[PDB]
Write a protein that binds this ligand. Sequence first.
Ligand code: P5V
Lengths: 160, 930
Amino acid sequence: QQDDNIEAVGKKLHEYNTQFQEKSREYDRLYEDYTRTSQEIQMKRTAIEAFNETIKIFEEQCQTQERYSKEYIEKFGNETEIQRIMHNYEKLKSRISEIVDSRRRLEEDLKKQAAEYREIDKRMNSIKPDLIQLRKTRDQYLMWLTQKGVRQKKLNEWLG
Amino acid sequence: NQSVVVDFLLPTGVYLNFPVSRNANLSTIKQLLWHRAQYEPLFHMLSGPEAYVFTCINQTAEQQELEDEQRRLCDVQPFLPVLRLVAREGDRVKKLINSQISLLIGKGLHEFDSLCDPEVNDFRAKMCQFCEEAAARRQQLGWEAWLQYSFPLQLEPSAPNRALLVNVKFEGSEESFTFQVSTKDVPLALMACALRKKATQPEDYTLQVNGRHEYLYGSYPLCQFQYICSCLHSGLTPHLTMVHSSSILAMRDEVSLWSLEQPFRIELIQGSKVNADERMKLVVQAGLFHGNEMLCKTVSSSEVSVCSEPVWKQRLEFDINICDLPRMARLCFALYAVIEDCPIAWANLMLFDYKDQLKTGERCLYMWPSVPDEKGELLNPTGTVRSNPNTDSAAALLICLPEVAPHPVYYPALEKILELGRHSEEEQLQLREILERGELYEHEKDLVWKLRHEVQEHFPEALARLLLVTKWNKHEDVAQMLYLLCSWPELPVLSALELLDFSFPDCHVGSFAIKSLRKLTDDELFQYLLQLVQVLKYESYLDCELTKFLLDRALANRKIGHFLFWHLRSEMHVPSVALRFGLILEAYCRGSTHHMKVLMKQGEALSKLKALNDFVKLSSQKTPKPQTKELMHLCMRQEAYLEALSHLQSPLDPSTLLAEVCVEQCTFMDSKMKPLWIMYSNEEAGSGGSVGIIFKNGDDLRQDMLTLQMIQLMDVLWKQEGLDLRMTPYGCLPTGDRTGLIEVVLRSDTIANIQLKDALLNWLKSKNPGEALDRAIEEFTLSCAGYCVATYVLGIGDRHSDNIMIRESGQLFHIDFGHFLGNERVPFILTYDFVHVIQQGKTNNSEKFERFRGYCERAYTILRRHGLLFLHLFALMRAAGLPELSCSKDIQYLKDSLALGKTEEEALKHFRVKFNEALRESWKTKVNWL
Ligand SMILES: O=C(C1CC1)N1CCC[C@]12C(=O)Nc1ccc(-c3ccc4nccnc4c3)cc12
C-alpha cells in the first residue's frame, strides 16, 4: 500500500560521503575565486574612475593653458617666450596620451577579468546539482541505516 | 627604488615633470617645485608657495586638497604621481573632513552620489546634520561632561574596606607624593589630600591613571575602579597624576491602500548576464514574504531555454490583494536551472519604498548567487534587499510593477491604523498552559489571536509569541495587532533583544524594541554591541531606528563610537553591507572629528602592518626565521613605517597608548598566517609599561571575537554575583578583510612549552617562590573552573597544551577558539595535570577538590539563570553568517549545554554526572603516554 545488506549500504554511504566532501572542497575553492575576482573587478573599476578623474584635471589644465596663454600671448617682440609656452603645452598634451594609453590597458584587463568572473559563476552553477544530489543521497543512506538500527559508532567510521 | 617622477600642473597652465623622493613631505616638494618653476615660463604671474595647496587623485578615486604638507608623498599615496596647484578657497573644513572620511571608511563618498538614489541622499542629509548638531552641542559643555564623553569610567561589575598607599604627582613635575587612603575613599578625597600635601579649589582637578587615558572621577569609591581593583589584587601601588580642568579644555579645544482589492501581480520580463548549462532550461520561482512567513503560495515562470539574456515577458499573479500587503512586504526571486535542481541566484525587493509609497514601474534587480546549504530552501527571504553592487558583471532580472492607480498610493499613516484597529475562568487555562512553563501549532495560534487582549493584560512578555500568530497577509489583523503594540507596556532588555530578530520585520516592532533598549547603561550596551551591528543586515531601509539608536550612543560615549566604527569598518569589504555600513561610518565621523584623528592614526599603522606581514609571509617560504626577523626590523626602521607604527591609541583599547615600537622585541609567530608580534613601551608604572599586539592577516577572527565576547559576558555575570574566576578576557578586534588585532597577555606561556610530572607545579614555584605559591594555585584553580564551564557551555573542543596557556600569576586561559557549538556534543573535560595542581601536588586532597567542584557548579548555575540572554544574543549572530552559527540546531546546542528544558536541581544533577565521568575519563587519558 505505502510505496541490499547493511555493509553494502555502509560502503556506499562512505563512497557518497567522500564524493560529497570532495565536491564541497571543489565548490569552496571556486567561491574563493568568485569572491577574490569580485574584489579585484571592483578595485579595477575604481582605478578606472581614478584614471578618468586624473584625465579630467589634465583637460582642465589644457583649457587653463589655452585661455590664460591667449589673453597674454598678444605681447609679440619675444617670439622666444611663445615657443617655450607652446613646447611646454605640447609636453602636457603628450603626457595625457600616456595616461589615456594606461587607462585603456586597464580597461582591457577588466574586460578579460569580467569574462573570468562569468566563467567561475558558470562552473559554480554546473557543480551545484552534483553537490546537492550528492548531499541528498548521503542523507538518504544515513536515514536508511538509522531506520535499520545501525549504531552511531558504525555510522561515524563510514563518515571518515 | 626611492625616487618617483611627479607631474606638476601649475595654475598658469604650465606643466613640469621632475623626480622627487617617495619619502619627501609635501612642504619639501613645494620648495623643489618653486626652485624649478622659476626657470619655466609665466613664473612671475604666480603668487607665493603658501598661497596654493596641492591637489591629487587619491586611491579611492577622489580629488583631495592636501592641506597637511608635513605628510610624505608615500603616505599620501596618490593614484598616479600628479600634483595640481589650486587656491586655498571656500570651506576648507568641509573639504578636509570629506577627504578624510573617504580614506578612513575605505569607500569614497562620490560612490554614494553615483547611485543617484534619493534614499541614500536623504540618509546622508538627515544623519550628517544630526551627528554634526550632537558634536556642536558637545563642544559647548564643561570639561567634566567632555571627560565623561571622551574617557568614560572603567568600573568593576560592583556597579572589603581595607586601606592602601597610592603614588600621586601633578602635571609637568618630576616630584610625587606617596600616602595611605581607604579602599572605600571616593576620588575627590584623594585629590584634596595631595592638594594640602602640595601646599604643606580641588574640584578643578581630575585623576589620570598615568601612561593611559583612564581618568578617576564622580561619586564612586576607589576599589570600584578597574585600575585600583587590579592594583589592590596584585598588591602593586597605583600611580596617579592630578590634571587641572584647563588641561582638559586644552584637549576638547585641540487614494487609500485598503481600497485596492485587485490581486498583487508582476510582469517578469527578462534575465541578464546568466551563466548556466546550455542543455538545461531556466525558471524564476517567485514568492512574497513578511520576515520568515510566506504571505501566500509561491508562483513560477515557464521553462525558457538557457541563455545569457533569457526572455519571459510573462505575468505572475499572487493569491493576495494589494490591500492586504503589510508595510514590510518583500518580493523574493530565485533563478533556477532545471532539466526537462540548480539554484543559480536570488534577489529580494521591498514592495513599499522608504517614504511608504507602493512601488510601480520597471525595477532592475542585480541578483546574488545562491549558495547550497543543508536547509536547501527554494527562496531566500532572510537575504538582503540591497541590489548587488557588481552592476556591470552580475546577473539581473528585469521586472515591471504595474500602475495600480492614477494617483500614487502610500501605506496608511499611524492615525488610519489606530482607526481600523480601535474598534475590537475557562479560556485563561489553555492560554496559561500555552505561554507559561517554543513553536506553536495552528490550533494554539487562533486561540492566542482570540485572547490577544488577555496576552497584553496578563502576559506582556509573550508579545513575541503573539506577533508570530498574527496573520500579516490580512490588513485587518495587522491593524488590530499594531493597535495593541502602541499601548503595549515597556518590556525588559532581555525581551527587547528577542524582538530585533528577523522574525519581526515590522517597523513598529523595531521601534518598540529600541524604546526598551534605551534604558541600557553604556557598560551593558557594550556587551551586546557586536549583536546590534549584525542585526542591521536584516534591516530593509537605511534610515531605521536601530541605526539612529547606535549613532546616539556612539556620539554620547567615545568608547562606544570607537568599537562601533571598527565593527562596521571591518565589513566594508562585504558587498551586501558596504553601502549601509559606509553611510553610518560617514555620519559617525562627522559627529566625531577628534576621534577621526585617533582612527586615522590607527588605520595607517594597520595599512603598514598589512604590508609588513605580506613581506614576512613571502620571506618565511624563502629563508629561515632569524634573517626574516632581521629583514622585518630593517623594513620597520624606515622613517615612514616607524612613524606610522609609533604613538597611536590601541585599537583594542583607546585609553592605552602604544607609544614606542620596540623593534628588537618585535617578531612573528610560526602559525600558518605568520601573525606579527609587535612590542611597545609607554609611561605606565610596571607590568603595563610594556604591551603587545598580534596583527593577524589571512584568518577570520570573528569566531574568536564572538567566543571572547561571550567569555567576557560570562565573567561579568559571574563577577555580578560575587564570584571572580580570575579570567583573562583579552581583546580581539576585527579591523578589515580577514584582518584584526589580538591583545598579547604577557608573562604567559603555552602548557606544551612549560612541559619542557610536576612540570606545571615547578613552573609555578619558580614564578611564585615561597609564600606567593598558595595564591598562584588559587588563581589556577578559579580560572581552570571558569574555562572548564565556558568551553563546556559554548561547545569548544580541540582543547590541548598548544592552545591552553598559564600566566605567571597562575591563571589558566585558552586561545585560538577555532570551533564552537560542537563544530556531536563536546563533553565536560577535566585534565589530570590541572587536577594535580588544584590538589597542591597531592594524590588525594578532597577539601581543595570540592572547592573546585563548587566553583564549576556555582559558575554553571549563574549561566543557566541568564541562559535566555545567551540564546537571544546567539539568535542575532545568525545574521553574521559564521559557518558554526548558521541555524536553530547551533542555537539548540546552547539550550542542551545549559539544560534550559530541565529544572535547576535536575540540571545541577546532570552536570554532576558529567563532572564525575570527566574525572574518571581524566585518569584513563593520562595513563596512555610515554
Ligand atoms: O611564539 C612566541 C613568540 C614568537 C612570538 N612566543 C612568545 C611567548 C611564548 C610564545 C611561544 O613560543 N608560543 C606561543 C604561542 C602563543 C602565545 C600567545 C601569548 C599571548 C597571547 N595573548 C592573547 C592571545 N594569544 C596569545 C598567544 C605566545 C607564544
